[PDB]
Design a protein around this nucleic acid. Structure first.
Ligand code: MG
Ligand code: MG
Ligand code: MG
Ligand code: MG
Ligand code: MG
Ligand code: MG
Ligand code: MG
Ligand code: MG
Ligand code: MG
Ligand code: MG
Ligand code: MG
Ligand code: MG
Ligand code: MG
Ligand code: MG
Ligand code: MG
Ligand code: MG
Ligand code: MG
Ligand code: MG
Ligand code: MG
Ligand code: MG
Ligand code: MG
Ligand code: MG
Ligand code: MG
Ligand code: MG
Ligand code: MG
Ligand code: MG
Ligand code: MG
Ligand code: MG
Ligand code: MG
Ligand code: MG
Ligand code: MG
Ligand code: MG
Ligand code: MG
Ligand code: MG
Ligand code: MG
Ligand code: MG
Ligand code: MG
Ligand code: MG
Ligand code: MG
Ligand code: MG
Ligand code: MG
Ligand code: MG
Ligand code: MG
Ligand code: MG
Ligand code: MG
Ligand code: MG
Ligand code: MG
Ligand code: MG
Ligand code: MG
Ligand code: MG
Ligand code: MG
Ligand code: MG
Ligand code: MG
Ligand code: MG
Ligand code: MG
Ligand code: MG
Ligand code: MG
Ligand code: MG
Ligand code: MG
Ligand code: MG
Ligand code: MG
Ligand code: MG
Ligand code: MG
Ligand code: MG
Ligand code: MG
Ligand code: MG
Ligand code: MG
Ligand code: MG
Ligand code: MG
Ligand code: MG
Ligand code: MG
Ligand code: MG
Ligand code: MG
Ligand code: MG
Ligand code: MG
Ligand code: MG
Ligand code: MG
Ligand code: MG
Ligand code: MG
Ligand code: MG
Ligand code: MG
Ligand code: MG
Ligand code: MG
Ligand code: MG
Ligand code: MG
Ligand code: MG
Ligand code: MG
Ligand code: MG
Ligand code: MG
Ligand code: MG
Ligand code: MG
Ligand code: MG
Ligand code: MG
Ligand code: MG
Ligand code: MG
Ligand code: MG
Ligand code: MG
Ligand code: MG
Ligand code: MG
Ligand code: MG
Ligand code: MG
Ligand code: MG
Ligand code: MG
Ligand code: MG
Ligand code: MG
Lengths: 46, 77, 10
RNA sequence: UAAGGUGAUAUGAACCGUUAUAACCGGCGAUUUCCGAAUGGGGAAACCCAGUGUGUUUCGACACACUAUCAUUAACUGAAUCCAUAGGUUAAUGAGGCGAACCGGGGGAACUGAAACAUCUAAGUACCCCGAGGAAAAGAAAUCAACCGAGAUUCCCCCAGUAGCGGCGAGCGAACGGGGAGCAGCCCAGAGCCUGAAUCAGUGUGUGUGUUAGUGGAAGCGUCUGGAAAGGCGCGCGAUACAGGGUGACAGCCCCGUACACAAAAAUGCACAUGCUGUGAGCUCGAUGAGUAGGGCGGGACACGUGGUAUCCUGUCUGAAUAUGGGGGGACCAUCCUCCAAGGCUAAAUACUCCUGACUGACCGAUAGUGAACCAGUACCGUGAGGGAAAGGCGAAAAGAAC
RNA sequence: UUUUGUAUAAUGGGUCAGCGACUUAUAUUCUGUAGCAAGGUUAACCGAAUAGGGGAGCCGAAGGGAAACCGAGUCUUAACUGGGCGUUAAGUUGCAGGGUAUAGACCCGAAACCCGGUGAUCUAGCCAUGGGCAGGUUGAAGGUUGGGUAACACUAACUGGAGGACCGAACCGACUAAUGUUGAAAAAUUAGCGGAUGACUUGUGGCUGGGGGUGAAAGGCCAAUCAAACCGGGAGAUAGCU
RNA sequence: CGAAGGUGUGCUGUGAGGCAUGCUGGAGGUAUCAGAAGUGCGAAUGCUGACAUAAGUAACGAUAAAGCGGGUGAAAAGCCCGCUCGCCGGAAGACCAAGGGUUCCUGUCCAACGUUAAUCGGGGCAGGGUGAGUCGACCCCUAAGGCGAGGCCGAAAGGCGUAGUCGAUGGGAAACAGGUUAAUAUUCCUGUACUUGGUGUUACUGCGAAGGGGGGACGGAGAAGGCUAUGUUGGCCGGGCG
RNA sequence: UACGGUGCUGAAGCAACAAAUGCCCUGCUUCCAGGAAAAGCCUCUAAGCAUCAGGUAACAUCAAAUCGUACCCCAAACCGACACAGGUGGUCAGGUAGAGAAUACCAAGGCGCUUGAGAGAACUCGGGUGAAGGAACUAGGCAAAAUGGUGCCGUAACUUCGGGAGAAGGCACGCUGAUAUGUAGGUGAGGUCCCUCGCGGAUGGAGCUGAAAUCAGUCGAAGAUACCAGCUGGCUGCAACUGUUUAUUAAAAACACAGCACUGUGCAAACACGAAAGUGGACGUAUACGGUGUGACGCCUGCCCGGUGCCGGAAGGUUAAUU
RNA sequence: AAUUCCUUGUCGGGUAAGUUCCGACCUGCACGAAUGGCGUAAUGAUGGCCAGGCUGUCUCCACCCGAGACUCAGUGAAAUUGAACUCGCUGUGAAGAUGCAGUGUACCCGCGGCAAGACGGAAAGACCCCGUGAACCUUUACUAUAGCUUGACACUGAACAU
RNA sequence: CUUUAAUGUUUGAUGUUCUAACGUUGACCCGUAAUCCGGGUUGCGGACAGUGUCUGGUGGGUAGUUUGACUGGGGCGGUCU
RNA sequence: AGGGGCGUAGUUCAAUUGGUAGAGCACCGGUUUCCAAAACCGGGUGUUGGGAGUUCGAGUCUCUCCGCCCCUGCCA
């Protein structure tokens, strides 16, 4: 039975990619928080 | 935005009161109006977004004097 | 999780 | 600075050095791919696609450089429209973003308390936004006092849980004055007479004192137990060094250090002196911040919730005097004191610690202490924001067990 | 543990080990204790600095009264023989402790409220661009040729191929029953069932964001969560309850 | 010459306890009197770790089905080979996109992983393997939509939007057959083609836009007709005489 | 030769018929709900060149980069915590029977589903058959059983004249031969004429393919023999209907629905989303749009304006800021 | 009657027997005309009722084929659990006893079965109540408020007539 | 003082006509390769409309809350000094 | 059941609500009409459900008791 996750690289990058996150300050605040936290993978982009 | 180009008046916030003194947040905005002022030196009409209080000071101060301050202010009339 | 068995006595 | 050395797991290999071009440490440079403010354009970040110009040639191409936007300034051109103006094209500068807390400003809750709940409280807190600095902000009386006087601002202790505020409930909560920390005053609203005066900012030029590598640094043997002595038992010695650490069990004299005494080619901080570049000191005569103060209306800020409510800020509507004049002295008036708003600048005492160094602890000792003593913001979970672990100890030496 | 009352067939616990709940700051009152004593004591700060300095202040030795005032008295009243409150009686500063107060205030636990973000890769609707629907029936309008009319109308035959038409696979739906219920599967399988050229279905993108969306409307759906999503913050909300 | 710790034993106090010792261990421990507390645990459906219980019970994942001989091996119901049997065959076959990321091929190994064993494996280890002018992507072009110079608006943040610039799921130049590797192939090889640009030569010569026009360029349903893929039969060729 | 393989050689390699959902077809016909864009491409000239440049044509020549390319891809490799009876878009579409991509059996090809071996109890699950009765069961014919195809005959109330209707009900179905040794039909060679001449036209009928019907015979209990494949009728409530809905206990009489009516709305429309700008409404204009209720169609929709709303009136009473 | 309490109203039809169904009656507790009324062909995984066919639905189950269950080998869970040396009866008792009293019975221990009890397991009861709990929703509850609307003033002027 | 007739004044009430604020989601020109915007020209409207402050009305459109206790369970009834 | 309301002329309703009960129709009597009615004139009617209390005095005020109405009898 179809579940909630249907993979799509183009959709995934357009929704949570580095350029999508950094386009707005609110997403840029996510990057600031993840940089402050020390995340190994800042964004979802490969 | 709602900013007077002469006096610099901008929206301010306050409270709606009531007979029960209940306070609700509100905004007070200036009585801004777009007017075409005749500047004699350039023999031209220059349009300014001014408040009603700003209109009174233009007569008192002169059209040229206020614009001189505006150029100092860099408001880009 | 579960769903409260409607074995309910009303 | 050096007789050793090619980072770690992590051996090995191939080598480099040994008295000074091994290595290591520090100063100053060089290089510094791609993404990212990202800035040639685009983009699903680490990719795609150019333009211009210079210079290369093997005539297939190739190598550099430049080309974002905005602000400011200056040129050149350039509409309707005659001048103009808007606009346009160049060229110079500057800004973009990131970062812990502290700071100023623009916005601004609710849970909660009131044993409910509207005013009120929570609270101008949380949070969002803007801006700046090493501090910020504030700041040189239209201030207070009370008929005596004080003399900018900030911070601390009192005053005092006082005076007051308050469904006069919950609760909120000064000031005057005093004791301290630290103190610093100036400029414009204008012209002269003097004159480059003081002072400040740039910079070089030295000195002094730091910072960024370092140098030297005292003094013990014997015996006993024991795998091993730093322990025991003897007898010494140093101490401006008995702070600590390491060494086969507890070391002042084994090692590293420590106390002291020293050190800089180069860069840099700080301070003094000094030289240039600006900067104006002093004197006289003037001038004395107007859509402002004040007022009406609606709010806000003052401990002060409209109350009899001064004072401050103003969204709205009005609107003076102006030194022969105004402001304040908690409604208001008179008298009397005190000050001169509607222009600015200003160090110190104050707040904070992402970061650097040293040191300290009746702080923790692996379920504790940072989530993390371990390749931890990792593994893992979640579309995402985000959440988030477990896991330390062989022995003195791996001698890690040939056969 | 909670109760008038539990062997109770009331709650709790499979066991062990580790961890796990009356603390802290400030102020205030009381007790104890120590010092000084009608006095006691300093705070900030200074300071080679736990000393010393600093008495700014605080408490006490005098109260009565709303207050002005008076004072071992005072208030009340015109006045008290009065009456109320006072007048012989040591306090103060440390330390420890018992209370109280403000803070999370002994610990654990809400459903929620508010703020800022993340989500329409699921699903709902919509937008753009593509795809899919075996086969077999029924035989509308219209058309032609006749018959009929003055002309129509009308009628017959033959052509035609209309439909949110029919039967029925793919596809899509999910009505009944059995199984399954620690599932093969956090909603399915088996045998039947409805739609199946359409208000159909589907692929790939896009858009609408939380008091908001979207909804052929069930309070449905909005990432296994919906009468107000998720994440973080206020936040150790609050919890007269257990 | 054996500290703490642990594990026995003995003694002792009214109790919480204390003392001493045997063994374990192998380096710390600490009198006394004071001082400070993260100062005492059985419970909180407490938290974390470890270990029981049910229990050698349920289950071992579609009732499509296996059997034998041989091989390898320490070991074969499960691997390899062979011969049968059975299952799918609009799929349970073949090729892709999306998505995954080496699972592909070869060698080697059986701890863990595989619901058993395993010599086997999508497990562990080491090598190898993905070859394009024509296939895709990139590129040119635009849809929905996004972003958006200036601009307009808005406390700030920001919102909308013009010129523009992105954005396929659509529109745009061209390759087929054969062969070959353990694993790749319209990519390699063989054979035979084709396309778009650049340069040069020769001849003939109106070129030219961010502009105009044409074209690109488009629905649903239905009806046949002409065909091919493909299948069948015959012929032909080769083999067979059961 | 290493079961692979490697090397060499290598015959025929045709016709007819059938035939797509593929191609012609981006066509044709028809309908109303009236069915992208841009660029490449073709062409036209402006300004700016017209000796040049540039264009056209023919040769020669260069260049075609970069990235992806294994493998899985209805699954043990993706989404489901699993080597999970689930989900996942496109392309390909063999033979016999059949209308068919249903179904049954097979080809190519791929598998036997990663615990087995015994035993043959109760009971449970998935199935088979059943004397006699035939719904007595049970809330209820739940389930099961039964019906089932083609052709033909025949077919009621009622009706909106379309339906109801596959109404019901019944008959014939195999095989062989004959009609007719392989028919009707379809396809169509050779041959023979004609051509301003070709992938031609007209004749011509060989050869293939091939129903359907009738008659005769024959076998069985049974000939639509398996699989496949409607149970039917009568009365009545509700909703007109196809459709939609509580993903995951409710598919309905609920919602929607065409239709009807009321009402708002004159276009800078009302309204809605937005502090605003603006956008939708709509590039529409009352034969339009929004809102509300009702819900095809047929016959119809009566009385009340007191209450509450709404609309109209504006004289008077009352009444804010302001003065 | 999808409405009717009394109620299984009364009568008729259907059945051997019909609280349902169908037809009427009207006494409409408490129908009623676009919150539409009445009819209505067709349609319906629509509700109720009846008939035929049909049958293991049943009288009343029997046998058979498979998959489990059982035995062996291998791998190997789970919910639960204060501790157990865990009998019946009658009585008592936080008032329904394996555990108390009395009395009876019972050698120790598996395996296959059935579920009466262990107030069995699951989940701090959804019903009820309570808290000066929470949330959504309604309205002529209260207080506000967006929006809409009124006027004054400002943006905002001139002239004339009454 | 009343009655007041006229007289200027000061405020308003309408009505009419203007343009010059303001409006234009009318036309035209330019910025400009532009259905935005701005500027220019012109027309129309016009001291209205519209907006600001203040103010009356309306306002489940949207919020924050209240909506008692005793009670042989609660509600209903009754009760509260 | 429980709670509210009601009982007035012959039938339907006013009542005053502490001191003396009306209206409509019906009925009766008299006119009018050939006669009935319609119309006109005139008029008599009541224990105010029953009882027991208040009070100097009750249909009225209080409480039971009959009869008749209207409401409730709800959550598991
Ligand atoms: Mg770039
Ligand atoms: Mg409260
Ligand atoms: Mg600095
Ligand atoms: Mg040294
Ligand atoms: Mg001044
Ligand atoms: Mg003023
Ligand atoms: Mg004020
Ligand atoms: Mg007062
Ligand atoms: Mg007050
Ligand atoms: Mg005041
Ligand atoms: Mg440890
Ligand atoms: Mg910890
Ligand atoms: Mg830890
Ligand atoms: Mg551990
Ligand atoms: Mg007891
Ligand atoms: Mg118990
Ligand atoms: Mg328990
Ligand atoms: Mg004391
Ligand atoms: Mg001291
Ligand atoms: Mg003093
Ligand atoms: Mg006295
Ligand atoms: Mg205390
Ligand atoms: Mg406490
Ligand atoms: Mg249909
Ligand atoms: Mg069908
Ligand atoms: Mg149908
Ligand atoms: Mg959900
Ligand atoms: Mg909410
Ligand atoms: Mg949260
Ligand atoms: Mg808080
Ligand atoms: Mg809490
Ligand atoms: Mg210790
Ligand atoms: Mg011992
Ligand atoms: Mg040791
Ligand atoms: Mg503790
Ligand atoms: Mg367990
Ligand atoms: Mg076993
Ligand atoms: Mg058992
Ligand atoms: Mg068993
Ligand atoms: Mg078993
Ligand atoms: Mg299996
Ligand atoms: Mg074998
Ligand atoms: Mg691997
Ligand atoms: Mg493999
Ligand atoms: Mg093994
Ligand atoms: Mg492998
Ligand atoms: Mg190639
Ligand atoms: Mg390539
Ligand atoms: Mg191609
Ligand atoms: Mg911009
Ligand atoms: Mg935009
Ligand atoms: Mg593009
Ligand atoms: Mg594409
Ligand atoms: Mg392959
Ligand atoms: Mg391949
Ligand atoms: Mg062919
Ligand atoms: Mg057409
Ligand atoms: Mg699978
Ligand atoms: Mg799962
Ligand atoms: Mg998985
Ligand atoms: Mg699918
Ligand atoms: Mg099939
Ligand atoms: Mg088969
Ligand atoms: Mg059996
Ligand atoms: Mg059964
Ligand atoms: Mg059967
Ligand atoms: Mg048989
Ligand atoms: Mg039978
Ligand atoms: Mg029989
Ligand atoms: Mg029966
Ligand atoms: Mg029976
Ligand atoms: Mg049935
Ligand atoms: Mg059957
Ligand atoms: Mg029928
Ligand atoms: Mg009925
Ligand atoms: Mg229906
Ligand atoms: Mg339907
Ligand atoms: Mg459901
Ligand atoms: Mg659905
Ligand atoms: Mg259902
Ligand atoms: Mg309806
Ligand atoms: Mg009326
Ligand atoms: Mg009305
Ligand atoms: Mg009934
Ligand atoms: Mg009867
Ligand atoms: Mg009936
Ligand atoms: Mg009705
Ligand atoms: Mg009506
Ligand atoms: Mg109606
Ligand atoms: Mg029915
Ligand atoms: Mg029957
Ligand atoms: Mg027992
Ligand atoms: Mg008993
Ligand atoms: Mg018993
Ligand atoms: Mg047993
Ligand atoms: Mg049983
Ligand atoms: Mg049982
Ligand atoms: Mg239980
Ligand atoms: Mg409970
Ligand atoms: Mg509950
Ligand atoms: Mg209560
Ligand atoms: Mg409300
Ligand atoms: Mg509240
Ligand atoms: Mg109560
Ligand atoms: Mg209820």
């Amino acid at each position: 039975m179809k579940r909630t996750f249907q993979p799509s690289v183009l959709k995934r990058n357009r929704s949570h990619g580095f350029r999508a996150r950094m386009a707005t300050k609110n997403g840029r605040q996510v990057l600031a928080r993840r940089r402050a936290k020390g995340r190994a993978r800042l964004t979802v982009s490969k | 935005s709602r900013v007077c180009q002469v006096t610099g008046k901008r929206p301010v916030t306050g409270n709606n009161r009531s007979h029960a003194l209940n306070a609700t947040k509100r905004r007070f905005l200036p009585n801004l109006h777009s007017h075409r002022f005749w500047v004699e030196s350039e023999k031209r009409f220059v349009t300014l977004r001014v408040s009603a209080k700003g209109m009174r000071v233009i007569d008192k101060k002169g059209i040229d004097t206020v614009l001189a301050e505006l150029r100092a202010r860099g408001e880009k009339y | 999780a579960a769903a409260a068995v409607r074995n309910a006595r009303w």
